[PDB]
Design an enzyme around this catalytic site. Structure first.
Site, PDB file in Angstrom:
ATOM      1  N   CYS A 172     -16.244  -0.474  -6.149  1.00  0.00           N
ATOM      2  CA  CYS A 172     -17.844  -0.507  -6.108  1.00  0.00           C
ATOM      3  C   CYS A 172     -18.280  -0.485  -7.728  1.00  0.00           C
ATOM      4  O   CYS A 172     -19.195  -1.487  -8.092  1.00  0.00           O
ATOM      5  CB  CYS A 172     -18.469   0.558  -5.475  1.00  0.00           C
ATOM      6  SG  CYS A 172     -18.244   2.177  -6.297  1.00  0.00           S
TER       7      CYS A 172
ATOM      8  N   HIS B 257     -20.887   6.482  -5.550  1.00  0.00           N
ATOM      9  CA  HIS B 257     -20.852   5.045  -5.310  1.00  0.00           C
ATOM     10  C   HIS B 257     -21.683   4.296  -6.374  1.00  0.00           C
ATOM     11  O   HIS B 257     -22.584   4.758  -6.905  1.00  0.00           O
ATOM     12  CB  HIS B 257     -21.297   5.002  -3.911  1.00  0.00           C
ATOM     13  CG  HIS B 257     -21.249   3.415  -3.306  1.00  0.00           C
ATOM     14  ND1 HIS B 257     -19.766   3.034  -3.306  1.00  0.00           N
ATOM     15  CD2 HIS B 257     -21.932   2.491  -2.803  1.00  0.00           C
ATOM     16  CE1 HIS B 257     -20.014   1.826  -2.665  1.00  0.00           C
ATOM     17  NE2 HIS B 257     -21.069   1.621  -2.516  1.00  0.00           N
TER      18      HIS B 257
ATOM     19  N   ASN C 210     -25.983  -3.610  -2.148  1.00  0.00           N
ATOM     20  CA  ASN C 210     -24.398  -3.017  -1.897  1.00  0.00           C
ATOM     21  C   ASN C 210     -23.443  -3.899  -2.098  1.00  0.00           C
ATOM     22  O   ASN C 210     -23.945  -5.421  -1.921  1.00  0.00           O
ATOM     23  CB  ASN C 210     -24.366  -2.373  -0.654  1.00  0.00           C
ATOM     24  CG  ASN C 210     -23.294  -1.103  -0.515  1.00  0.00           C
ATOM     25  OD1 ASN C 210     -22.613  -0.981  -1.384  1.00  0.00           O
ATOM     26  ND2 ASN C 210     -23.242  -0.480   0.744  1.00  0.00           N
TER      27      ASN C 210
HETATM   28  C1  LIG Z   1     -17.094   3.225  -5.169  1.00  0.00           C
HETATM   29  C2  LIG Z   1     -16.639   2.771  -4.016  1.00  0.00           C
HETATM   30  O1  LIG Z   1     -15.794   1.730  -3.925  1.00  0.00           O
HETATM   31  N1  LIG Z   1     -16.582   3.506  -2.898  1.00  0.00           N
HETATM   32  C3  LIG Z   1     -15.872   3.389  -1.889  1.00  0.00           C
HETATM   33  C4  LIG Z   1     -15.954   2.050  -0.991  1.00  0.00           C
HETATM   34  O2  LIG Z   1     -17.058   1.734  -0.938  1.00  0.00           O
HETATM   35  N2  LIG Z   1     -15.062   1.727  -0.363  1.00  0.00           N
HETATM   36  C5  LIG Z   1     -13.661   2.221  -0.202  1.00  0.00           C
HETATM   37  C6  LIG Z   1     -13.038   1.227   0.817  1.00  0.00           C
HETATM   38  C7  LIG Z   1     -13.950   0.079   0.958  1.00  0.00           C
HETATM   39  C8  LIG Z   1     -15.342   0.704   0.588  1.00  0.00           C
HETATM   40  C9  LIG Z   1     -15.876   1.251   1.912  1.00  0.00           C
HETATM   41  O3  LIG Z   1     -15.896   2.539   2.197  1.00  0.00           O
HETATM   42  O4  LIG Z   1     -16.346   0.524   2.883  1.00  0.00           O
HETATM   43  C10 LIG Z   1     -15.904   4.508  -0.919  1.00  0.00           C
HETATM   44  C11 LIG Z   1     -15.217   5.779  -1.713  1.00  0.00           C
HETATM   45  C12 LIG Z   1     -17.178   4.978  -0.217  1.00  0.00           C
HETATM   46  C13 LIG Z   1     -17.358   5.958   0.698  1.00  0.00           C
HETATM   47  C14 LIG Z   1     -16.094   3.900  -6.334  1.00  0.00           C
HETATM   48  O5  LIG Z   1     -15.191   4.989  -5.553  1.00  0.00           O
HETATM   49  C15 LIG Z   1     -16.606   4.297  -7.451  1.00  0.00           C
HETATM   50  O6  LIG Z   1     -16.024   3.605  -8.602  1.00  0.00           O
HETATM   51  N3  LIG Z   1     -17.299   5.320  -7.602  1.00  0.00           N
HETATM   52  C16 LIG Z   1     -17.915   5.750  -9.314  1.00  0.00           C
HETATM   53  C17 LIG Z   1     -18.977   5.028  -9.300  1.00  0.00           C
HETATM   54  C18 LIG Z   1     -19.736   5.706 -10.613  1.00  0.00           C
END
Ligand SMILES: *[C@@H](C(=O)N[C@H](C(=O)N1CCC[C@H]1C(=O)O)[C@@H](C)CC)[C@H](O)C(=O)NCCC
Length: 253
Positions: free
Chosen positions: A30, A200, A220
């Site tokens: 993300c 996120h 998003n």
């Molecule tokens: C943010 C991130 O990518 N978060 C995850 C996410 O969106 N995912 C992981 C698997 C696919 C997708 C999903 O859940 O559908 C997840 C941890 C959210 C619950 C990333 O973790 C990040 O870089 N965070 C720091 C931002 C400052």
């Protein structure tokens, strides 16, 4: 004066990236998606439409050494620093396969119903930094790089954030993701139930107010089936889930 509502897609409709929703797939990237989306928007907005680029999420995700753990999460400031110093090449989704380095991972449904395969629980390993444009794209990798001039954190003040978005374009922003966010379907989100799932990062494109309730309007990176055609709204003005406290952006000039 700040208007009651603002939508970057309406101010700068020549810039196709602003109304584009992406899909990070089965990867915790993300941080890289919010970055290259807002950098794509700002490269077009701030160049008067000269740069019309979709910047490559995989280039940033795979090659920025200082941005954290790749598909295991990252850090916003170093992502924008990487754009300033090294720059990022172009690259679309896997399915569109345009530009220098299209994303290697397929669309999937993120905690919601729809026509794509479910994302499920497995996470891909961070892709390698390949530094090579796809065969059909006839600009060499280093020559396809787009660079910023400056990057910065935006002051944690509602009006400052609004002014920044309306003058310079969409921003990237972090917030704390709680379990009830993965159930969001529509409306103005606030955290009511569930425990934290960490941080996120998303792209704030504007703001508005409905039934006296102010909100931020946010893209998003979970494809168009999630939320409100890929977007969501969140309470504005109360630092909900720290949404006003982790805003980062930058400029090409
Ligand atoms: C943010 C991130 O990518 N978060 C995850 C996410 O969106 N995912 C992981 C698997 C696919 C997708 C999903 O859940 O559908 C997840 C941890 C959210 C619950 C990333 O973790 C990040 O870089 N965070 C720091 C931002 C400052």
């Amino acid at each position: 004066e700040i208007p009651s509502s603002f939508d970057s897609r309406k101010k700068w409709p020549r810039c196709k990236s602003i109304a584009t929703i992406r899909d990070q797939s089965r990867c915790g990237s993300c941080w890289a998606f919010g970055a290259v989306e807002a950098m794509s928007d700002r490269s077009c907005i701030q160049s008067g439409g000269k740069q019309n680029v979709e910047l490559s999420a995989v280039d940033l995700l795979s090659c920025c050494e200082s941005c954290g753990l790749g598909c295991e999460g990252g850090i916003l400031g170093p992502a924008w620093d990487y754009w300033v110093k090294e720059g990022i090449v172009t690259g679309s989704s896997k399915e569109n396969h345009a530009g220098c380095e299209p994303y290697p991972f397929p669309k999937c449904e993120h905690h919601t119903k729809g026509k794509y395969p479910p994302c499920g629980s497995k996470i891909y390993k961070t892709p390698r930094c390949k530094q090579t444009c796809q065969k059909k794209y006839k600009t060499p990798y280093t020559q396809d790089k787009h660079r910023g001039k400056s990057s910065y954190n935006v002051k944690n003040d509602e009006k400052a954030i609004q002014k920044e978005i309306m003058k310079y374009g969409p921003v990237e922003a972090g917030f704390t993701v709680y379990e009830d966010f993965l159930n969001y379907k529509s409306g103005i989100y606030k955290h009511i139930t569930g425990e934290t799932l960490g941080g996120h990062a998303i792209r704030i494109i504007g703001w508005g107010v409905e039934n006296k309730a102010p909100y931020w309007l946010i893209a998003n990176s979970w494809n168009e089936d999630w939320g409100e055609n890929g977007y969501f709204r969140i309470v504005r003005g109360r630092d909900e889930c720290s949404i006003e406290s982790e805003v980062t952006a930058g400029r090409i000039n």
